[PDB]
Write an enzyme that holds these catalytic residues in place. Structure first.
Site, PDB file in Angstrom:
ATOM      1  N   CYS B 108       0.781  -1.233   0.000  1.00 58.68           N
ATOM      2  CA  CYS B 108       0.000   0.000   0.000  1.00 58.68           C
ATOM      3  C   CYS B 108       0.792   1.250   0.000  1.00 58.68           C
ATOM      4  CB  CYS B 108      -1.165   0.048   1.032  1.00 58.68           C
ATOM      5  SG  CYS B 108      -2.121   1.588   1.014  1.00 58.68           S
ATOM      6  N   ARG B 111      -0.166   4.679   2.638  1.00 57.36           N
ATOM      7  CA  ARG B 111      -0.187   4.366   4.069  1.00 57.36           C
ATOM      8  C   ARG B 111       0.202   5.560   4.947  1.00 57.36           C
ATOM      9  NH1 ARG B 111       3.528  -0.645   4.919  1.00 57.36           N
ATOM     10  NH2 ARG B 111       4.209  -0.117   2.763  1.00 57.36           N
ATOM     11  N   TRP B 280      -9.042   6.733  -1.266  1.00 57.13           N
ATOM     12  CA  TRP B 280      -9.292   7.406  -2.562  1.00 57.13           C
ATOM     13  C   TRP B 280      -8.307   6.908  -3.673  1.00 57.13           C
ATOM     14  CZ3 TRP B 280      -8.434  10.120   1.992  1.00 57.13           C
ATOM     15  CH2 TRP B 280      -7.100  10.551   2.226  1.00 57.13           C
ATOM     16  N   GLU B 285      -4.315   3.945 -11.233  1.00 51.55           N
ATOM     17  CA  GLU B 285      -5.154   2.741 -11.087  1.00 51.55           C
ATOM     18  C   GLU B 285      -6.222   2.728 -12.178  1.00 51.55           C
ATOM     19  OE1 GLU B 285      -6.184   1.646  -6.932  1.00 51.55           O
ATOM     20  OE2 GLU B 285      -5.507   3.689  -6.486  1.00 51.55           O
TER      21      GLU B 285
HETATM   22  C1  HEM Z   1      -6.290   6.694   1.286  1.00 52.41           C
HETATM   23  C2  HEM Z   1      -6.014   6.467  -0.004  1.00 52.41           C
HETATM   24  C3  HEM Z   1      -5.298   5.257  -0.436  1.00 52.41           C
HETATM   25  C4  HEM Z   1      -4.468   5.167  -1.536  1.00 52.41           C
HETATM   26  C5  HEM Z   1      -4.062   6.245  -2.513  1.00 52.41           C
HETATM   27  C6  HEM Z   1      -4.028   3.811  -1.601  1.00 52.41           C
HETATM   28  C7  HEM Z   1      -3.174   3.384  -2.593  1.00 52.41           C
HETATM   29  C8  HEM Z   1      -3.063   2.036  -2.864  1.00 52.41           C
HETATM   30  C9  HEM Z   1      -2.768   1.517  -4.165  1.00 52.41           C
HETATM   31  C10 HEM Z   1      -2.560   2.334  -5.434  1.00 52.41           C
HETATM   32  C11 HEM Z   1      -2.688   0.184  -3.984  1.00 52.41           C
HETATM   33  C12 HEM Z   1      -2.436  -0.885  -5.018  1.00 52.41           C
HETATM   34  C13 HEM Z   1      -3.664  -0.850  -5.944  1.00 52.41           C
HETATM   35  C14 HEM Z   1      -3.596  -1.987  -6.911  1.00 52.41           C
HETATM   36  O1  HEM Z   1      -2.815  -1.959  -7.855  1.00 52.41           O
HETATM   37  O2  HEM Z   1      -4.335  -2.982  -6.782  1.00 52.41           O
HETATM   38  C15 HEM Z   1      -2.979  -0.102  -2.617  1.00 52.41           C
HETATM   39  C16 HEM Z   1      -2.968  -1.390  -2.097  1.00 52.41           C
HETATM   40  C17 HEM Z   1      -3.561  -1.712  -0.860  1.00 52.41           C
HETATM   41  N1  HEM Z   1      -3.992  -0.812   0.070  1.00 52.41           N
HETATM   42 FE1  HEM Z   1      -4.177   1.082  -0.209  1.00 52.41          FE
HETATM   43  N2  HEM Z   1      -4.452   3.101  -0.552  1.00 52.41           N
HETATM   44  C18 HEM Z   1      -5.311   3.865   0.147  1.00 52.41           C
HETATM   45  C19 HEM Z   1      -6.109   3.442   1.223  1.00 52.41           C
HETATM   46  C20 HEM Z   1      -6.193   2.163   1.790  1.00 52.41           C
HETATM   47  C21 HEM Z   1      -7.042   1.821   2.815  1.00 52.41           C
HETATM   48  C22 HEM Z   1      -8.073   2.690   3.472  1.00 52.41           C
HETATM   49  C23 HEM Z   1      -6.744   0.524   3.133  1.00 52.41           C
HETATM   50  C24 HEM Z   1      -7.313  -0.300   4.230  1.00 52.41           C
HETATM   51  C25 HEM Z   1      -7.838   0.116   5.439  1.00 52.41           C
HETATM   52  C26 HEM Z   1      -5.748   0.082   2.232  1.00 52.41           C
HETATM   53  C27 HEM Z   1      -5.128  -1.134   2.188  1.00 52.41           C
HETATM   54  C28 HEM Z   1      -4.466  -1.591   1.061  1.00 52.41           C
HETATM   55  C29 HEM Z   1      -4.178  -3.032   0.877  1.00 52.41           C
HETATM   56  C30 HEM Z   1      -4.472  -4.178   1.864  1.00 52.41           C
HETATM   57  C31 HEM Z   1      -3.583  -3.103  -0.342  1.00 52.41           C
HETATM   58  C32 HEM Z   1      -3.040  -4.357  -1.045  1.00 52.41           C
HETATM   59  C33 HEM Z   1      -4.154  -5.160  -1.711  1.00 52.41           C
HETATM   60  C34 HEM Z   1      -3.754  -6.401  -2.473  1.00 52.41           C
HETATM   61  O3  HEM Z   1      -2.772  -7.130  -2.185  1.00 52.41           O
HETATM   62  O4  HEM Z   1      -4.471  -6.701  -3.446  1.00 52.41           O
HETATM   63  N3  HEM Z   1      -5.393   1.100   1.449  1.00 52.41           N
HETATM   64  N4  HEM Z   1      -3.097   1.070  -1.855  1.00 52.41           N
HETATM   65  C1  LIG Z   2      -5.696 -11.129  -8.409  1.00 53.30           C
HETATM   66  C2  LIG Z   2      -5.590 -10.089  -7.318  1.00 53.30           C
HETATM   67  C3  LIG Z   2      -4.895 -10.392  -6.143  1.00 53.30           C
HETATM   68  C4  LIG Z   2      -4.797  -9.411  -5.139  1.00 53.30           C
HETATM   69  N1  LIG Z   2      -4.135  -9.640  -3.956  1.00 53.30           N
HETATM   70  N2  LIG Z   2      -5.387  -8.205  -5.342  1.00 53.30           N
HETATM   71  C5  LIG Z   2      -6.060  -7.889  -6.469  1.00 53.30           C
HETATM   72  C6  LIG Z   2      -6.663  -6.504  -6.563  1.00 53.30           C
HETATM   73  C7  LIG Z   2      -7.508  -6.240  -5.292  1.00 53.30           C
HETATM   74  C8  LIG Z   2      -7.179  -4.885  -4.654  1.00 53.30           C
HETATM   75  C9  LIG Z   2      -6.800  -4.811  -3.314  1.00 53.30           C
HETATM   76  C10 LIG Z   2      -6.480  -3.558  -2.750  1.00 53.30           C
HETATM   77  C11 LIG Z   2      -6.561  -2.394  -3.541  1.00 53.30           C
HETATM   78  C12 LIG Z   2      -6.977  -2.503  -4.886  1.00 53.30           C
HETATM   79  C13 LIG Z   2      -7.076  -1.276  -5.752  1.00 53.30           C
HETATM   80  C14 LIG Z   2      -7.128  -1.541  -7.302  1.00 53.30           C
HETATM   81  N3  LIG Z   2      -6.797  -0.374  -8.176  1.00 53.30           N
HETATM   82  C15 LIG Z   2      -8.292  -0.529  -5.292  1.00 53.30           C
HETATM   83  C16 LIG Z   2      -8.008   0.534  -4.202  1.00 53.30           C
HETATM   84  C17 LIG Z   2      -8.566   0.351  -2.935  1.00 53.30           C
HETATM   85  C18 LIG Z   2      -8.308   1.293  -1.905  1.00 53.30           C
HETATM   86  C19 LIG Z   2      -8.943   1.017  -0.560  1.00 53.30           C
HETATM   87  C20 LIG Z   2      -7.638   2.464  -2.263  1.00 53.30           C
HETATM   88  C21 LIG Z   2      -7.072   2.627  -3.522  1.00 53.30           C
HETATM   89  N4  LIG Z   2      -6.401   3.743  -3.894  1.00 53.30           N
HETATM   90  N5  LIG Z   2      -7.313   1.667  -4.501  1.00 53.30           N
HETATM   91  N6  LIG Z   2      -7.256  -3.738  -5.390  1.00 53.30           N
HETATM   92  C22 LIG Z   2      -6.179  -8.833  -7.495  1.00 53.30           C
END
Ligand code: HEM
Ligand SMILES: Cc1cc(N)nc(CCc2cccc([C@@H](CN)Cc3cc(C)cc(N)n3)n2)c1
Ligand code: HEM
Ligand SMILES: Cc1cc(N)nc(CCc2cccc([C@@H](CN)Cc3cc(C)cc(N)n3)n2)c1
Ligand SMILES: C[C@H](O)[C@H](O)[C@H]1CNc2nc(N)[nH]c(=O)c2N1
Ligand SMILES: C[C@H](O)[C@H](O)[C@H]1CNc2nc(N)[nH]c(=O)c2N1
Ligand SMILES: [Zn+2]
Lengths: 407, 411
Positions: B108, B111, B280, B285
């Site tokens: 993330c 963070r 947000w 993305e």
């Molecule tokens: C506040 C604005 C936030 C921004 C800009 C942001 C940004 C991102 C981005 C760009 C990703 C990867 C997106 C992707 O390619 O799938 C991400 C991953 C993630 N973020 Fe955030 N984030 C935010 C808030 C949060 C919040 C509120 C949570 C949880 C309480 C969170 C938890 C995560 C988790 C668990 C992942 C990894 C998900 C996975 O493995 O698929 N994020 N963050």
């Molecule tokens: C296949 C697969 C595996 C894996 N671990 N995760 C995915 C995508 C699921 C996922 C998890 C977290 C965040 C996202 C982002 C995709 N652009 C969505 C997102 C969510 C949040 C809370 C904020 C943010 N900026 N963007 N997607 C797909």
């Protein structure tokens, strides 16, 4: 123990078994992944030799033949008596090609079997090293039609008689810090440029001065040689639409040639093994030109383009980045100097991976290095899971000689 | 043991001790790195150490470690576990744990915000219609008419694994995908399978290119139920370009609220299988991944066409050119409509400041370079040049298999 890699774009899954032959360690453990870290006697050598000869004889479909047994026998004899051994020409060529095949960070490896190997093991002085390298440069350059090549100097003995090319690449530009406080030329080479001066190089003090070679024969003190200016092919950088681009006065050299790495074959260590291919455009356009600690030209280009630099969110950096990269590619192609774009190169590597999975049972790859430094997810390698592991023969990083050498 | 990471742009070196508190495994060994692999029922037995370790972290973070209160709480949870085989978190513990799961989320980039997370406690929820109501409320609160606020809603924890709460949607808002008979896709190719489940369960599909999907909500191990989010609660942004006036005629739009709903929150050994969370968007993305992946809306060709770029050779970099314009448009559109969005320069710069802050006050920041570096313009962002250590800390968010693969149908 048998491992799957998925492509998330195409769903193609490959099964990797080759990793079970992995000999060296990664940096990672079950507790910590170090995937993004840049740098993570008689008794030992016999196993290494055996491992290598086994794979060699296997490759020529003569595994467990009398010729296989005799050679293992002969190398064993030689180690016992001499404490090292010498590779046959055939083995040396195999070793070098396979070190490139095993280069987990190299996107260009589809080419790996077309590698021109120059056996410089008979070299004894720095002047001979200079001669070998000039010939490598001219051969590989081939008037713009670049050919992959390696030049392999004599192997390490007691480690007090190392051959070393002190340069990091054969061809690179000097860096000089200014009274002005800033940096003229390439900031990456300040330290090596000073060393050169310290040893006596008279530096022209320009922005794009091809550095001299500092060559170390037989553990001796290194000496300086200017590569003949006419062997160093350079390209003036222009843009196909922006006439002002040429006014920036950018050029880059055609031949990327890595010269500070160590080739390990069957336990033997080749500490001077300059090697060369051809550029992928992003190397020059994204990294050399745009890295903040490199020529750092983004700001000047953006201004000439009259973009809004008030706010990051206009993506002015991104806009200027694409244009610089269009200009690099266009200039190389216009001058007929081999270059590959990142779309073409990554597409080639996906094909090579399929091939290596099919014919070899895998292909070690380091995703962090393979995915280009611009436009990542629009290239197929972004979506390809990769397993990174270390096979031998290999190329290895080694300490910069000025930290080792005793003068 | 101490671990150093270097930044290759600045020569700033940092020292990681935090990784010593890492419990879970990575997928990697000394012989293989699994760093680019996407995806690499508890007994009392295993529960009490997990609870103790959590409560120790919590009481430390409140300067109450070893207090009467800390000890009384250990004893109380211990007894509850041995008597009921599970335990309940206090409200301030649930809060702490949900914020820490975020803080510890190594993929993330956003963070820097982790301590501002609105936690909605939906543990009194019992039905799917109840779930729908808590989710509406989350979306309304989080959207805040374009001035986005981070939030999480936390439904009841797993008990025997037969009574799971789950949101079947992968995000609360996402567009339907319809795989056509000529083999083309209409809408979002990522959501075909789910759209087909919605349809079978009874959804009347509008079948256009941007249909907001229904929620499919499972409470207490029951068969999932469909609900339509009130359209007035779904904020959307029409995509236009500051210079290119034909860009609007592409008919593109996207929703303002990224809200992940298929992950599992683990806090002190307890498993929260429905814990939708929202933040947000970072512009890439949508503009890079959602619009330009080949397996998604795939608009690169049409955009470059309209830009009249030379498309006969990849070395014109026509794809890269169109890519930048699309991303300019997404940022422009969101900003023009006053809907929170961050560009990838700003977000990676903030992250690096967050990461350094964490090293100083916390002793490290687990980070996954493969996910942190943006999918365009990688090396002109500071994160490209930053060495990172990836390790797993709890509390954490974890992946779980999609529920249609595992659900026992009641009928
Ligand atoms: C506040 C604005 C936030 C921004 C800009 C942001 C940004 C991102 C981005 C760009 C990703 C990867 C997106 C992707 O390619 O799938 C991400 C991953 C993630 N973020 Fe955030 N984030 C935010 C808030 C949060 C919040 C509120 C949570 C949880 C309480 C969170 C938890 C995560 C988790 C668990 C992942 C990894 C998900 C996975 O493995 O698929 N994020 N963050
Ligand atoms: C296949 C697969 C595996 C894996 N671990 N995760 C995915 C995508 C699921 C996922 C998890 C977290 C965040 C996202 C982002 C995709 N652009 C969505 C997102 C969510 C949040 C809370 C904020 C943010 N900026 N963007 N997607 C797909
Ligand atoms: C023929 C054209 C070739 C192309 C297009 C190419 C492409 C690349 C690129 C882009 C990199 C990353 C370099 C960086 O970012 O600094 C790389 C790394 C590397 N390549 Fe190649 N390659 C080529 C030939 C070769 C040859 C001839 C060898 C050796 C025989 C080689 C061995 C390596 C090694 C060892 C690395 C990583 C070294 C390190 O960690 O710095 N490649 N390749
Ligand atoms: C600190 C550090 C560690 C490490 N292992 N490598 C470096 C960079 C040195 C290096 C090694 C191999 C290749 C390159 C490329 C730089 N763009 C040059 C290159 C070489 C070759 C043989 C082909 C090609 N296309 N490009 N640079 C720096
Ligand atoms: C810290 C990070 O590992 C470092 O910036 C890497 C990232 N990926 C890279 N990839 C390539 N091809 N070349 C590089 O120099 C780097 N640098
Ligand atoms: C195989 C590879 O790990 C996969 O494409 C990953 C790469 N990096 C990513 N990074 C982010 N932020 N999001 C992603 O979906 C991915 N996909
Ligand atoms: Zn790893």
């Amino acid at each position: 123990r048998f491992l799957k890699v998925k492509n998330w774009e195409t769903d193609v899954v490959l099964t990797d078994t080759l990793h079970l032959k992995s000999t060296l360690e990664t940096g990672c453990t079950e507790h910590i992944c170090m995937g993004s870290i840049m740098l993570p006697t008689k008794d030992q050598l016999f196993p290494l030799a055996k491992e290598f000869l086994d794979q060699y004889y296997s490759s020529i479909k003569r595994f467990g033949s009398k010729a296989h047994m005799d050679r293992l026998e002969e190398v064993n004899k030689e180690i016992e008596s001499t404490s090292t051994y010498q590779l046959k020409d055939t083995e040396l060529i195999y070793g070098a090609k396979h070190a490139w095949r095993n280069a987990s960070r190299c996107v260009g490896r589809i080419q790996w079997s077309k590698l021109q190997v120059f056996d410089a093991r008979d070299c004894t002085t720095a002047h001979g090293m200079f001669n070998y390298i000039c010939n490598h440069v001219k051969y590989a350059t081939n008037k713009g039609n670049l050919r992959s090549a390696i030049t392999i100097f004599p192997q390490r003995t007691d480690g007090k008689h190392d051959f070393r090319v002190w340069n990091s690449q054969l061809i690179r530009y000097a860096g000089y810090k200014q009274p002005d406080g800033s940096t003229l030329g390439d900031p990456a080479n300040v330290q090596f440029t000073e060393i050169c001066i310290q040893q006596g190089w008279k530096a022209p003090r320009g922005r794009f001065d091809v550095l001299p070679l500092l060559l170390q024969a037989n553990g001796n003190d290194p000496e300086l040689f200017q590569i003949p200016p006419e062997l160093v092919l350079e390209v003036p950088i222009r843009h196909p639409k922006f006439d002002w681009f040429k006014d920036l006065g950018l050029k880059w050299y055609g031949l990327p040639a890595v010269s500070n790495m160590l080739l390990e074959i069957g336990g033997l260590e080749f500490s001077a093994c300059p090697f060369s291919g051809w550029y992928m455009g992003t190397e020059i356009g994204v990294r050399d030109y745009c890295d903040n600690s490199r020529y750092n030209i983004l700001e000047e280009v953006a201004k000439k383009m009259d973009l809004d630099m008030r706010k990051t969110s206009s993506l002015w950096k991104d806009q200027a980045l694409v244009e610089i990269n269009i200009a690099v590619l266009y200039s190389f192609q216009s001058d007929k100097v081999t270059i590959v774009d990142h779309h073409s190169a990554t597409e080639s590597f996906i094909k090579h991976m399929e091939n290596e999975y099919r014919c070899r049972g895998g292909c070690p790859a380091d995703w962090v290095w393979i995915v280009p430094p611009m436009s990542g997810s629009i290239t197929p390698v972004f979506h390809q899971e990769m397993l990174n592991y270390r096979l031998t023969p290999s190329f290895e990083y080694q300490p910069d000689p000025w930290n080792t050498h005793v003068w």
